[PDB]
Design a protein around this ligand. Structure first.
Ligand SMILES: Cc1ncc(COP(=O)(O)O)c(CN)c1O
Ligand SMILES: Cc1ncc(COP(=O)(O)O)c(CN)c1O
Ligand SMILES: N=C(N)NCCCC=O
Ligand SMILES: N=C(N)NCCCC=O
Ligand SMILES: [Cl-]
Ligand code: NA
Ligand code: NA
Lengths: 470, 465
């Protein structure tokens, strides 16, 4: 079976450079929208991320095509997924809107060109200063998370004499087959209890500068099944319908959140999405079909807002990291007898550069971009440069082991695929390694830097100290 | 439960009545005489406050531990915290510095550590990194691979500057810390022990590489003395043997770091070998084991140690403002009520205090604004991030913490023992800024030593029109 695993992985390798809309090969190198990534990793210092604006556009089209059966849909990119300004601008250019989770996320969306009526503000903590900024900028929605926050919205909206447009976020009591930390609709810190929606909405109606637009929920992240979306949307729809009758109102909209999964493992025939959510399980079309069906049982004219994040960018980046050292190690037992030997390959990216590979057991395809057409036929362990004993990549092809060509040598470029969601803002300067540069491939296939690597002077500029040596 | 609550409040009283770091005044938690509620009104929360006096106390513990061995050299592992004012306090306390990257070496030099006070560790030292170290006359480069040693030979020859090295070896010694924190067993780091002899033979023959000794590091937060005793004995036996074989006298032996810090103080209720939030040993037990083994061989040789966590761990407190609150209902998959949860939201989440989420790390949590009030209410403590999992799971009982029932939005919550591995691991996830850092100096005065990331700082890395 360990040869079949190896055989299967190289079947996947050949699929990347043969039937993948993102990738080709040239001179034995992995290519991304026609850009030789080996050559690219010689022009910029590794490790760095390369994003594909073509692939962002493709993903966005998939999301929008998915909702064709409901004309009045509004799509808000969850900027928490990636808020590099060049990536935000590409998403604005593609024609959808923006969702933000903090005052500075709202500000950067405004700065990059999203209008206030293109921005939704989510979050379990919106301090008075955050609310005042949001209300002064005529945000499309502030998705109210608590009665405490609502009291501030009432007072600040009156103070500003500006209408605050709100959804009431409710927990629909719907679990999902994703990471425990990634469920947000079941025993959650976020949202009001469903039971509190009625009186909350009633009070918003009486508030002169707070305009109730609808109800909000968000199921979770990387949800690999359509049923949670159907169940949760039904809860929201049923309460929306009931409140319309009870309160004598007509809701502008309903906001069903995000959570469309992205494939991080592609050989679906070998995977069970309900046991391993690296298998996506559903497409954007399944998500749309589930949401739209439930909403249409209530109104076909109401506006549906969605908040996809991961799906917009997840598949649209690659992490490029150079093999920087190598060693063979012996593993002994407690009495000093050999157990095995381990071929360690060290790349210049650790978990401070790719957080979820460590902290959320996230799988990304790993290939030798310099030897993309070579058989990946050696079992190796892939370590980062950090001090932590545990800074190596545990989510291997088999156990903690990866497959690379037996010819791999120091200086080869290793590529992590599907590296575009939740990979940039989560970086650290642990061990004072810099956070990575970020390169963008535009619609013409041309590359440019859209974020610099942190410089040394960046490592210290935040500190206040007396310099001792120049 | 009632017992857990009484025990937690006995611990609370001990914080303000029998802890060298803390007092109470006006009902508020004080740190070295500084009112932390008052301090949190002067700076935007969340932020960290470090105590230079406690850093000094910790270094004194470490150096008093080694009183039986005159020639001991102590290198603060700067990966623990390299805020420049923290490095300055450590430098001013009189010990040395260890670095894990070219930029760590540079900031150590810039803040005033001399080259001869700096050890460079790392499994990846690229030629540019090695050249920078060699050019700066570092006391040690702890060689981690033969591949790296070949670059050291060539660069040292090219610069005509002597490179001072240890050979790091894996001692084959497991330890009862986190799997991710073991570094002396099945590790990515070090050479196999059998490779030491030939590697040392070849270094001797290199004209611009000087062999100082052997190096190992057992792990981080090691709750037991036996692994250090056993790993040191391995290094000492092989140091003795190579001295005989090669006819040399080693400069030193470097036994690394790993002195644990108490994150739970009620040791009478603790199993350190299952829950290493209990420290299990002290610096003195660490020194006793190391010195006991080295002294079977040489009493004159220099012992190098690389403590990180022990220097700063106990010397900081994360201050975070209660910023929202709500009560929720947890239902089962049949609409039946399971329980009722009181959520308190602070303005710090795991992007500020990484290890509370990513390594299941426990820190004492108290209401600094109501530190003299009974912590008599069961709450769940959430951060502000989008993630549903951004709440503090390492509670007083399960995922539940105790705070005064009087707790209000605007109160200041303190996380204790927040001084190790808490700053450089922060992120700007959700575009919340990495925190400011305040230092209480030796005279009890406060000053900002790191600014909170501003909006501008965070967009400044991007290249856009
Ligand atoms: C309220 C809300 N909206 C949308 C999203 C986006 O999630 P995803 O990236 O999985 O689409 C999130 C992030 N979990 C969220 O918290
Ligand atoms: C080589 C080396 N020495 C010293 C340390 C510091 O360890 P600690 O903070 O547990 O004392 C580390 C990090 N575990 C290390 O990798
Ligand atoms: N999360 C932490 N503290 N990791 C590092 C432990 C020491 C290793 O370098
Ligand atoms: N680090 C990750 N991916 N967290 C969950 C992402 C969605 C939550 O907001
Ligand atoms: Cl010293
Ligand atoms: Na109103
Ligand atoms: Na020599």
């Amino acid at each position: 079976m360990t040869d079949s695993i190896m055989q299967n992985y190289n079947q996947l390798r050949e699929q990347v450079i043969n039937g993948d809309r993102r990738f080709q090969h040239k001179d034995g190198h992995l290519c991304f929208e026609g850009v030789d990534l080996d050559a690219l990793a010689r022009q910029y210092p590794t490790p760095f991320y390369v994003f594909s604006e073509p692939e962002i556009i493709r993903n966005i089209h998939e999301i929008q095509q998915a909702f064709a059966a409901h004309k009045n849909t509004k799509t808000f990119f969850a900027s928490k997924t990636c808020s590099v300004m060049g990536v935000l601008k590409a998403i604005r250019d593609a024609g959808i809107c923006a969702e933000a989770n903090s005052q500075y996320e709202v500000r950067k969306c405004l700065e990059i060109g999203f209008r206030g009526d293109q921005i939704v503000f989510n979050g379990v903590v919106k301090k008075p200063a955050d609310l005042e900024y949001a209300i002064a900028n005529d945000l499309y929605l502030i998705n109210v998370d608590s009665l405490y926050e609502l009291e501030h919205i009432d007072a600040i909206s009156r103070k500003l004499k500006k209408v605050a447009n709100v959804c009431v976020r409710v927990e629909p009591n719907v679990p999902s087959a994703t990471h425990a930390e990634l469920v947000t609709a079941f025993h959650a810190k976020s949202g009001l209890d469903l039971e509190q929606a009625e009186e909350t909405c009633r009070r918003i109606l009486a508030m002169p500068y707070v305009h109730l637009r609808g109800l909000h929920m968000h199921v979770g992240d990387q949800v690999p099944e359509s049923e949670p979306f159907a169940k949760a949307t039904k809860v929201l729809v049923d309460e929306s319908r009931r409140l319309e009758e009870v309160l004598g109102i007509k809701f502008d909209l309903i906001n069903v959140g995000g959570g469309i999964p992205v494939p991080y493992k592609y050989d679906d025939e070998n995977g069970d999405p309900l046991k391993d959510n690296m298998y996506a399980g559903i497409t954007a079309q399944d998500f749309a079909d589930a949401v739209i069906r439930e909403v249409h049982k209530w109104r076909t004219d109401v506006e549906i807002c969605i908040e996809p994040g991961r799906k917009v960018t997840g598949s649209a980046a690659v992490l490029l990291t150079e093999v920087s050292c190598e060693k063979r190690k012996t593993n002994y037992d407690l009495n000093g007898n050999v157990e095995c030997h381990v071929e360690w390959k060290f790349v210049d990216a650790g978990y401070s550069v790719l957080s979820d590979s460590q902290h959320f057991d996230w799988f990304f395809y790993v290939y030798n971009a310099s030897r993309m057409t070579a058989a990946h036929d050696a079992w190796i362990k892939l370590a980062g440069p950090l001090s932590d004993g545990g800074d190596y990549f545990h989510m291997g092809v088999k156990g903690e082991e990866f497959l690379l060509p037996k010819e791999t040598h120091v200086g080869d470029i290793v590529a992590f695929l599907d590296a575009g969601a939740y990979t940039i803002e989560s970086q650290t300067v642990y061990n004072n390694r810099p956070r990575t540069g970020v390169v963008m491939i535009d619609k013409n296939g041309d590359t440019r830097l859209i974020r610099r690597e942190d410089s040394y002077e960046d490592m210290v500029k935040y500190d206040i100290y007396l310099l001792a040596a120049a």
